[PDB]
Amino acid sequence: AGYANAADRESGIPAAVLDGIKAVAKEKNATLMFRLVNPHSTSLIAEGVATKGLGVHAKSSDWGLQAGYIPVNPNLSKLFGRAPEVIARADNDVNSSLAHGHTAVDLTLSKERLDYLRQAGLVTGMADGVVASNHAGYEQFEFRVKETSDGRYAVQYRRKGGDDFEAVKVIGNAAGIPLTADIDMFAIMPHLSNFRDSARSSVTSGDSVTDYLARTRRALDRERIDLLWKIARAGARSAVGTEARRQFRYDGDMNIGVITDFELEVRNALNRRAHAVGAQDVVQHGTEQNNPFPEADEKIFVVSATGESQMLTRGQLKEYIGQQRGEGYVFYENRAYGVAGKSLFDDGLGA
């Protein structure tokens, strides 16, 4: 279908990736919630540009031809007219990332992003390559582009009145692909029945309770009531990932953060769909519910297990969770919401 409404188009998720999103949500029967994707990345993710992980703490850029990528030169980044300390703490960050498998690559644009840049006014014009702009950065920096035989355009730059142009450098894959912001998941609310099997293998040997007592007993049930509480416990416990959330998971050598078995099963199903269209991985880490520095991003994109999609204010967000909790979808919140007074639950919340 592509995009079916305003929320879809406001999410900033590229049309073909959202289709898989909708599909994974129904296939796995779970509400999937996301933080808005900056619109300047939408196009890069759509044509296969790479997505960053928790490793990269380098600041991205929101202006000039480098908009959307993560500049090695911290001044070409959004932290532009910032100062010594900032620009400086900024250096380690960039440097921090290249220590671990990240390479620094020459920035080159597709003819398409080129179109997009000038269409969005991030680039107010160009000689046939001496591009212009009204961002504060152009009074301190000079830019120009160079076609190549590939179809792309090399981006070069220099400092006002200083002398020679050098390509702009941007962080990327170990595999050399440059990186752009990743799709952040706000939270994942699976339907309790996704944990049947899971409870069964923890307690039965993967069998129904009736089949297990038949298989190990012999012709008030106290033993039976016991087993049932045991599957209820086990089920709640995987649904909410109690154990999994005690450690860090990894994907190859990249740290994915704290994530439940289900949350990542979801990550892989999405990254799959993503590959089926032309993109790279787009969900590089767990949910905001286990982020230790929680964002107060204030509009969350929601995609129901039914496939319907919508935008919610933090207020309509509690109503939603509660509605959905009533239908059997499970939710757990960021452990730091309570002590801060921003809990999404209206209950005891105590002992």
């Binding site: 309790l192 049932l228 599957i231 416990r233």
Partner: protein, 69 residues
């Protein structure tokens, strides 16, 4: 040995509505999503077995015992 916060996230799975009590209807919806069709008598029996103080539902402190077993 689960922590108080771990035990409270699990409590919320059962306690679907607002209140802090797991009622019979809530426990039944839980048990069949975890694949066990139960009769009302069987639900009652699970509640009963957990319901220390006798009101007809499971409160946070009773859920903790049913969890430490």
């Amino acid at each position: 040995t689960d922590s108080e916060e771990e035990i409270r996230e699990a409590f919320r799975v059962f306690d679907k509505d607002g209140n802090g009590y797991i009622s019979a209807a809530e426990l039944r919806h839980v048990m069949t999503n975890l694949g066990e069709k139960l009769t009302d008598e069987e639900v009652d029996e699970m509640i009963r077995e957990a319901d220390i103080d006798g009101d007809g539902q499971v409160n946070y402190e009773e859920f903790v015992q049913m969890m430490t077993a």
